[model samples]
Target: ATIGRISTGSKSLDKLLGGGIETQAITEVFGEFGSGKTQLAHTLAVMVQLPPEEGGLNGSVMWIDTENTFRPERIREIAQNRGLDPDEVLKHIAYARAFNSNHQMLLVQQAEDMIKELLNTDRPVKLLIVDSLTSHFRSEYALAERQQKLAKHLADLHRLANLYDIAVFVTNQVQANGGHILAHSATLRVYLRKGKGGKRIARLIDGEAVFSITEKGIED
Candidate 1:
């Protein structure tokens, strides 16, 4: 089945995504430090709260913070800028802060648990953001061990996204090959970079375009 798409909150970026981010799949956004990867994640967190008419899923968000980078303050800024009630947007988000590799791995299951809890509520959870998924893996494992674990972690993530029919958006710090396992598993992969002034370039499989990062989050 072809799952419906959710707007990414930026019209230009949405065009690049072929309307919007697709549900039931993983979208990987990678870039070097200061390349606006986390900002994109934060943007989607707020975007998911928008009504379907506004190109959103009209659902809630789960943000798993592994690198201590999940900032509610930023989400608030984006929401207010987009004319959404910041408080209302915050209410729909469930946040988890992970300190280590094991803790990070465990949070994926915990998100599943939250899914069950949210299903009975008015807002059904529809977006999952693992901010920088491979940071812990790179720090805690190596060689075949790293590859095996990375593959397994991605598999589990993909399973939950497809099974629950939601969007799983993850950020990765750029590697030489731009994260092997993650690159291969993602249904849509985008490479981001900081540009002159407030501009940032995003390189997709088909092509590349420049965007801007501001107090309102990522924009055209």
Candidate 2:
């Protein structure tokens, strides 16, 4: 909190981050299908509502779902598990679903407007999350075109992060393209994968770590 960071909703995960998601930065959480990337996103949305003393910015969250994975029921479960009011938690989160790549890019502009409005509220927006940052681009563009579009998209997302001092959390899907579009664009690149019961494997860039996932949310 003193460091202007956003917790990942797990004590162990925060320590692993040497704090938490830094403000004015993009943290890319990428993995294959069912790797819990979107789950982590949902977890952060609820966690960002916590008081700063408990590792939050006491702010609202904006979530862009490009993969149709945002679930209110899941948020309710996480909220209840964290000892928070499920109704209040869901109210604090603003969500949108992007249909295609073009729509995805345009939502950022719309998000800017929403952020401006929220800035007048007690709980200003502090986190911008994009679930599956690469799905549309992967399906809509060829290799070269996809890279070009991704570069531009990254710049846009990057600009919003710095300008608003908001934590940008983007989830990505893996492909056979030999490299990830955000392999180097992210401030912190994390690799997530399935593990033993109630757990997930997390590798920070080229390294390795471990954490658990329960019906409630992510845990140590």
Candidate 3:
């Protein structure tokens, strides 16, 4: 079982992640606003389309946009910078906008169906990204109800990652307040923050890396 890895468009960041983001697991990235969480998600949506030898899984992506953060223009810029056809790159990314917490959970179910349909296709879905996973839950539920719903939602995400052997990446706001539920559900947790010299810092368990977000994409 050789797990696939998808680059973050930053060499140093990839090294910090022990190669890149892992397949068949939930990798959660949490941080304050303007900390490059959405930028990383956009970068991965494009990077996952590259062939395996080029630090990609040679597959497409499923973007569940919870906070209205999916930008096609950003994806175009990154794809153009990577020397790929922007139109084709955009076509490969299947995007969905989740309006509420119920819609967010429903989108995952829809994603599972899509993944199954694409299982034998050339552009099989390889990466699943939920940009700001807790936004809806944070607003829609009370403490007790939110915990129960969030736990179920995370379990659904984990099942999709394992069942399809795809990489699951979700972003969390620092103030979302999921607490232990989010920390324990994710297989890998990364914290992002602003750093000196306009760079961004990413902290994984024992590793740290510095990267910068440019108009094109992420870079070391």
Local distance difference test scores for all models: 0.83, 0.84, 0.89
Clashes of 3: 0
The sequence of per-residue lDDT tens digits that candidate 1 reaches over residues 8-116 is 7667788888877888989998878878889889988888888888878788899888888988899999999988999999989989898887888899988999888
Q: Write the per-residue lDDT of candidate 3 for residues 1-220, one digit (tens) a residue.
A: 4688999989989998888899988999988888899999999888889988878887888999987778999999999998889999999999999999999999999999999999999889999999879888988888889989999999999999988989999998884543332757799999999998899999884268999998658988
Clashes of 1: 0
CA RMSD of each candidate after superposition: 2.0, 2.0, 1.8
lDDT of 2 at 131: 91
Q: Output the better candidate (2/3) by lDDT.
A: 3
TM-score for all predictions? 0.93, 0.93, 0.95
lDDT of 2 by residue, 31-125 (tens): 77778888899888988898888777888989999878999999999989988899998998888999999999999999999888887787988
Please count the clashing residue pairs in each candidate, in the order shown.
0, 0, 0
| Index of the highest-lDDT prediction | 3
